[PDB]
Amino acid sequence: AYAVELKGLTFKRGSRAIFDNIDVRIPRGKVTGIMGPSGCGKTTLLRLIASQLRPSKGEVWVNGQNLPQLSRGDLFDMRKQFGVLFQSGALFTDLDVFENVAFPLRVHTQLPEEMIRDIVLMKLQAVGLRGAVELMPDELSGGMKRRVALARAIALDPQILLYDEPFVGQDPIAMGVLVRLIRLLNDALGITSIVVSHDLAETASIADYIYIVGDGRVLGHGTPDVLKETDDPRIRQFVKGIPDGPVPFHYPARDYRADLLG
């Protein structure tokens, strides 16, 4: 069926209305991507499907049953189904790289310590960053501090894995290797991938069913091509440069002739 479904979901932070009756339907096996202008809280939609933030009302069908209606004895087991990847890696500074990638194994699973080593190595291998199995996260350049986090994600073989603005703020090489890695992951393992990154220029390549999110509601959805010609004013303003549109370019000044003379 579908991987993640949010039928009639909404969420607010101290009466701020971050999301109002939004709805997203993620297809299993395909790299969907949500994105939106600065401040729409894409990351906030990320943590909802990861049960890191409680939805005000709605339900989140993740790989079947909904999350916020489960006991911790079952939600903690559903945590095995998906990983994440926050930009800047979000690496544990207390643990060196090997424990940093073994951590998800040392929580959900009780495997012989030597099996954890084989699994982590064969995981750090796929992500390339296998050599520094003893370095410390501060020693790792911001480029490879993300691939090791991706390796941590793909441990336990999660069926879906999110991405929090992965390719934002890095050279075209360290971004090319990361997009190749997410492509290899989704294509080979046959696991969903939800790239939550506002940079459309790169996501449009790796997006199968790309969504848009802005002003607290689902701002259309489809394949990248059909959103390049969406004809929606706000969305056609987003998907191309076109600075001024539904989102303004100026600030609500009183008047130029007013401030300049009076």
């Binding site: 095995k80 495997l111 012989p112 099996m115 064969m122 796929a126 073989d157 393992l189």
Partner: protein, 98 residues
Amino acid sequence: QASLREGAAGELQLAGVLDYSSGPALREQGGRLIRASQAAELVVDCSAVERSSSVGISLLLAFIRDARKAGKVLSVRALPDDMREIAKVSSLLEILPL
């Protein structure tokens, strides 16, 4: 969920679901209790393996790291296509012989 039988005298067979739970138990009941026989060139036929994941790869991978210790040689036959993918993802292509 899964089991390990027919060993200690030749072809050692696998069962269906090699998940994370059935990982350590299968490893232990196969690691020595089957390998330590020193019978012949062990063949591990993963025929009736319905579903598996990287824990299964490490299981097949721990299966050889003691044969290398015990002197004898073993190789996998009929490797299921899902584990084939899980291995092809990492650079592991010929490190696991078949």
